[PDB]
A paper describes a structure:
IN function is assisted by the cellular cofactor lens epithelium-derived growth factor (LEDGF/p75), which binds tightly to a site at the catalytic core domain dimer interface. An additional class of IN inhibitors, the allosteric inhibitors of integrase (ALLINIs), act at a second site on HIV IN.
To investigate the mechanism of GSK002 resistance further, we determined three high-resolution crystal structures, one of GSK002 bound to catalytic core domain-only, one of GSK002 bound to the catalytic core domain containing the Ala124 substitution, and one of GSK002 bound to the catalytic core domain with Thr125. A model predicting GSK002 activity using the top four most influential amino acid substitutions (K20R, A124N, T125X, where X ≠ T, and K188R) performed well under cross validation, where the cross-validated mean-squared error decreased from 8.49 to 2.26. The protein structures were quite similar, with RMSDs ranging from 0.09 to 0.13 Å in pairwise comparisons. However, the azaindole core of the bound GSK002 ligand is seen to shift in position by ~0.5 Å, depending on the identity of the substitutions at residue 125, along with movement of the difluorobenzyl group by almost 1 Å. Substitutions at residue 124 could affect ALLINI binding or the catalytic core domain–CTD interaction. Overlay of the catalytic core domain•GSK002 structures on the IN•GSK1264 structure suggests a further mechanism of resistance. Thus, the larger side chains in the resistance substitutions appear to either clash directly with the IN CTD or displace the bound inhibitor sufficiently to result in an inhibitor clash with the CTD.
Numbering used by the authors:
A (entry chain A), B (entry chain A): 56 to 138, 149 to 188, 193 to 209
The structure:
Amino acid sequence: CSPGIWQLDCTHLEGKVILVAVHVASGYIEAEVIPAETGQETAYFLLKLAGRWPVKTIHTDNGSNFTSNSVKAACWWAGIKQEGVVESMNKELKKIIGQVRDQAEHLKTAVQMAVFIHNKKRKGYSAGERIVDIIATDIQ
Amino acid sequence: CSPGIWQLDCTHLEGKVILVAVHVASGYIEAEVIPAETGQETAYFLLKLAGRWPVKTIHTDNGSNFTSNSVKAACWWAGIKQEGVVESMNKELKKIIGQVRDQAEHLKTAVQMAVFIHNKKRKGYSAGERIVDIIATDIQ
Ligand SMILES: Cc1nc2c(ccn2Cc2ccc(F)c(F)c2)c(-c2ccc3c(c2C)CCCO3)c1[C@H](OC(C)(C)C)C(=O)O
Ligand SMILES: Cc1nc2c(ccn2Cc2ccc(F)c(F)c2)c(-c2ccc3c(c2C)CCCO3)c1[C@H](OC(C)(C)C)C(=O)O
């Protein structure tokens, strides 16, 4: 679909929170392990994401995630609006984390290894290749 | 120069550490405010960076930054090797942080606003546009 659409959701593992952003058109993922599921953590994650990619619109499976003043400020400043692929990309990431978990002490390390594996896996291009292609083409 | 080359250095501000990664060929920046200047923080940052972009080689102005076992493990796993633009990109970021600093409570928020401003500024393409173009072209 549209190249500026991202989906953001949190998932829970080992008593920690993983914020997962999916670029809907490519299946590319960005993720961070956050101390708590708060509006200030979501706002900070959104500022980082928007500085890296041309973020136009954000989707989520939990609308209340985006009600804080912190989040609304991040979206206002960065010029962001609110509105099977995402379910599939999140499923694949949770399974990859499980598969690499014993290779690291920290959950956050296993998460970043799973993001890397996911983005680099060709399906024939990878999600990492598709995002860069989708965004470059849209610039032209 | 080569599209897989990144430069990583830390800078200090308000008693905190900012890890700054520059994509040498585009001038694109990624940055994080880290609790301390440690090998484990650098290793974690490198895993995140390598999952997002095709990182081949890393440069730094402080070689001792990359001696820890943590860093060597991150580079080994991600398949990374060691070897005016970077000085210019870091200079521009420090000045942008100064210019936006009073708009936020936290230094980390001002840092991410400065990264966003820097990557989106056209010079006529922006660093954010150039990185995506350089990487997409290299895939083809
Ligand atoms: C926490 C951590 N420590 C690491 C390392 C590597 C060496 N050390 C030092 C050390 C010393 C004594 C040990 F008994 C011991 F087990 C590890 C990684 C690490 C770093 C990068 C990395 C991998 C590991 C395990 C796995 C493959 C992907 O890349 C870690 C690591 O944590 C940080 C990334 C935060 C450094 C971890 O969670 O295990
Ligand atoms: C820490 C923080 N709090 C924020 C917000 C916004 C509302 N609030 C709540 C609040 C409540 C009462 C206040 F007196 C008060 F001043 C702010 C931003 C924030 C979030 C996004 C953002 C901006 C700000 C100021 C500036 C432009 C770029 O986008 C913050 C912010 O910190 C996080 C990003 C970690 C949430 C900050 O450092 O100020």
